[PDB]
Amino acid sequence: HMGASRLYTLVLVLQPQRVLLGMKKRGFGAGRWNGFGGKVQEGETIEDGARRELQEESGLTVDALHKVGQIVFEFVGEPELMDVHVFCTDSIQGTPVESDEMRPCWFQLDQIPFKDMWPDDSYWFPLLLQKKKFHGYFKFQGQDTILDYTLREVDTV
Ligand SMILES: c1ccc([C@H]2COCCN2c2ccnc3n[nH]cc23)cc1
Protein backbone atom coordinates (compact mmCIF):
# COMPACT_ATOMS: atom_id res chain seq x y z
CA HIS A 1 0.00 0.00 0.00
CA MET A 2 1.70 3.11 -1.34
CA GLY A 3 1.71 6.48 0.33
CA ALA A 4 2.69 8.12 3.56
CA SER A 5 1.04 6.55 6.54
CA ARG A 6 0.54 7.79 10.06
CA LEU A 7 1.49 5.52 12.98
CA TYR A 8 -1.20 4.59 15.51
CA THR A 9 -1.45 2.14 18.37
CA LEU A 10 -4.32 -0.01 19.54
CA VAL A 11 -4.18 -1.88 22.83
CA LEU A 12 -6.45 -4.71 23.93
CA VAL A 13 -6.37 -5.61 27.59
CA LEU A 14 -7.42 -9.25 27.20
CA GLN A 15 -7.85 -11.29 30.36
CA PRO A 16 -8.91 -14.94 30.30
CA GLN A 17 -12.67 -14.21 30.49
CA ARG A 18 -13.00 -10.50 29.61
CA VAL A 19 -11.63 -7.66 27.50
CA LEU A 20 -11.41 -3.98 28.34
CA LEU A 21 -12.74 -1.54 25.77
CA GLY A 22 -13.26 2.20 25.86
CA MET A 23 -16.15 4.25 24.55
CA LYS A 24 -14.49 7.02 22.52
CA LYS A 25 -15.86 10.30 23.84
CA ARG A 26 -14.50 12.75 21.28
CA GLY A 27 -12.75 13.10 17.96
CA PHE A 28 -12.83 10.72 15.02
CA GLY A 29 -14.88 7.58 15.80
CA ALA A 30 -16.57 9.09 18.90
CA GLY A 31 -19.51 6.88 19.96
CA ARG A 32 -17.85 3.51 19.30
CA TRP A 33 -16.15 1.07 21.67
CA ASN A 34 -12.52 0.43 20.74
CA GLY A 35 -9.20 -0.61 22.16
CA PHE A 36 -7.01 2.08 23.70
CA GLY A 37 -4.51 4.02 21.69
CA GLY A 38 -4.03 6.82 19.27
CA LYS A 39 -1.40 8.59 17.23
CA VAL A 40 2.26 7.91 17.90
CA GLN A 41 4.24 11.10 18.65
CA GLU A 42 7.73 12.25 17.70
CA GLY A 43 10.34 11.06 20.18
CA GLU A 44 8.63 7.89 21.41
CA THR A 45 8.72 4.33 20.19
CA ILE A 46 5.51 2.73 18.98
CA GLU A 47 5.24 0.62 22.15
CA ASP A 48 6.01 3.76 24.26
CA GLY A 49 3.11 5.49 22.47
CA ALA A 50 0.83 2.55 23.18
CA ARG A 51 1.73 2.74 26.89
CA ARG A 52 1.29 6.52 26.91
CA GLU A 53 -2.15 6.35 25.31
CA LEU A 54 -3.30 3.52 27.58
CA GLN A 55 -2.28 5.54 30.66
CA GLU A 56 -3.78 8.79 29.41
CA GLU A 57 -7.05 7.11 28.42
CA SER A 58 -7.60 4.62 31.27
CA GLY A 59 -4.96 5.38 33.92
CA LEU A 60 -3.49 1.90 33.48
CA THR A 61 0.12 0.94 33.23
CA VAL A 62 1.14 -2.58 32.24
CA ASP A 63 4.08 -4.88 32.70
CA ALA A 64 4.24 -6.03 29.07
CA LEU A 65 2.65 -5.31 25.69
CA HIS A 66 2.76 -7.97 23.00
CA LYS A 67 2.61 -7.27 19.28
CA VAL A 68 -0.39 -9.09 17.81
CA GLY A 69 -1.23 -7.35 14.57
CA GLN A 70 -0.90 -4.60 12.06
CA ILE A 71 -3.83 -2.96 10.27
CA VAL A 72 -3.62 -0.46 7.45
CA PHE A 73 -6.68 1.76 6.93
CA GLU A 74 -7.52 3.82 3.86
CA PHE A 75 -10.35 6.31 4.21
CA VAL A 76 -11.60 7.43 0.79
CA GLY A 77 -10.73 11.09 0.26
CA GLU A 78 -8.14 11.22 3.08
CA PRO A 79 -4.56 11.40 1.79
CA GLU A 80 -2.87 9.77 4.78
CA LEU A 81 -3.12 6.02 5.39
CA MET A 82 -3.38 4.82 8.98
CA ASP A 83 -0.75 2.30 10.04
CA VAL A 84 -2.15 0.74 13.23
CA HIS A 85 0.06 -1.41 15.46
CA VAL A 86 -2.08 -3.69 17.59
CA PHE A 87 -0.97 -4.94 21.01
CA CYS A 88 -2.38 -7.25 23.65
CA THR A 89 -1.69 -7.34 27.41
CA ASP A 90 -2.81 -9.38 30.41
CA SER A 91 -0.59 -7.53 32.91
CA ILE A 92 -2.45 -4.39 33.92
CA GLN A 93 -1.34 -2.63 37.09
CA GLY A 94 -4.55 -1.08 38.40
CA THR A 95 -8.24 -0.47 37.89
CA PRO A 96 -9.19 1.49 34.78
CA VAL A 97 -10.83 4.93 35.19
CA GLU A 98 -12.63 7.24 32.78
CA SER A 99 -10.69 9.96 30.97
CA ASP A 100 -11.50 12.89 28.73
CA GLU A 101 -10.98 10.57 25.75
CA MET A 102 -12.38 7.17 26.82
CA ARG A 103 -14.95 5.58 29.16
CA PRO A 104 -13.59 2.08 30.00
CA CYS A 105 -15.74 -0.98 30.56
CA TRP A 106 -15.08 -4.73 30.81
CA PHE A 107 -16.88 -7.08 28.46
CA GLN A 108 -17.25 -10.84 28.66
CA LEU A 109 -15.73 -12.46 25.56
CA ASP A 110 -19.17 -13.66 24.41
CA GLN A 111 -20.66 -10.11 24.86
CA ILE A 112 -18.21 -8.04 22.85
CA PRO A 113 -20.31 -5.16 21.49
CA PHE A 114 -19.48 -5.60 17.79
CA LYS A 115 -22.56 -3.65 16.61
CA ASP A 116 -21.20 -0.55 18.45
CA MET A 117 -17.60 -1.06 17.27
CA TRP A 118 -15.78 -0.29 14.04
CA PRO A 119 -16.93 -2.84 11.45
CA ASP A 120 -13.39 -4.12 10.81
CA ASP A 121 -13.18 -5.33 14.44
CA SER A 122 -15.69 -8.07 13.60
CA TYR A 123 -13.02 -9.50 11.25
CA TRP A 124 -9.81 -9.27 13.30
CA PHE A 125 -10.98 -9.43 16.94
CA PRO A 126 -11.67 -13.17 16.61
CA LEU A 127 -8.04 -13.70 15.54
CA LEU A 128 -6.90 -11.77 18.59
CA LEU A 129 -9.15 -13.92 20.82
CA GLN A 130 -7.68 -17.01 19.16
CA LYS A 131 -4.12 -15.76 19.90
CA LYS A 132 -3.26 -15.56 16.20
CA LYS A 133 -1.12 -12.72 14.83
CA PHE A 134 -2.44 -10.91 11.78
CA HIS A 135 -2.00 -8.33 9.06
CA GLY A 136 -5.09 -6.53 7.82
CA TYR A 137 -5.98 -3.85 5.31
CA PHE A 138 -9.41 -2.16 5.24
CA LYS A 139 -10.57 0.49 2.75
CA PHE A 140 -13.43 2.57 4.18
CA GLN A 141 -15.95 4.88 2.57
CA GLY A 142 -16.75 7.04 5.59
CA GLN A 143 -17.04 5.37 8.98
CA ASP A 144 -19.55 2.61 8.17
CA THR A 145 -18.70 0.96 4.85
CA ILE A 146 -15.81 -1.39 4.14
CA LEU A 147 -15.23 -1.34 0.39
CA ASP A 148 -12.25 -3.68 0.22
CA TYR A 149 -10.22 -5.67 2.70
CA THR A 150 -7.48 -8.21 3.15
CA LEU A 151 -6.75 -10.23 6.25
CA ARG A 152 -4.20 -12.97 6.91
CA GLU A 153 -2.32 -14.59 9.73
CA VAL A 154 1.42 -13.96 10.05
CA ASP A 155 4.39 -15.42 11.96
CA THR A 156 5.99 -11.98 12.46
CA VAL A 157 3.87 -8.87 13.08
C1 LIG B 1 -6.56 3.59 18.27
C2 LIG B 1 -6.51 3.59 16.86
C3 LIG B 1 -7.65 3.88 16.11
C4 LIG B 1 -8.86 4.17 16.78
C5 LIG B 1 -10.11 4.49 15.99
C6 LIG B 1 -10.46 5.97 16.25
O7 LIG B 1 -9.56 6.78 15.52
C8 LIG B 1 -9.81 6.65 14.12
C9 LIG B 1 -9.42 5.23 13.67
N10 LIG B 1 -10.00 4.23 14.56
C11 LIG B 1 -10.36 2.99 14.02
C12 LIG B 1 -10.61 2.93 12.64
C13 LIG B 1 -11.00 1.71 12.06
N14 LIG B 1 -11.15 0.56 12.75
C15 LIG B 1 -10.90 0.66 14.07
N16 LIG B 1 -10.96 -0.33 15.03
N17 LIG B 1 -10.64 0.11 16.27
C18 LIG B 1 -10.37 1.38 16.14
C19 LIG B 1 -10.50 1.82 14.78
C20 LIG B 1 -8.90 4.17 18.18
C21 LIG B 1 -7.76 3.88 18.94
Q: What angle do CA 58, 41, 70 make, to 5 degrees?
A: 75
57 lines ligand 1 (CB under 6 A): no
State the method: X-ray
101 lines ligand 1 (CB under 6 A): no
Q: How many CB atoms lie within 10 A of CB 112?
A: 19
Resolution in A: 1.5
- Check if the beta carbon of residue 88 is closer than 8 Å to that of residue 65: yes
Distance CA 75, CA 94 (A): 35
In the chain the domains, ranked by start, together with CATH numbers, are: 1-157 (3.90.79.10)
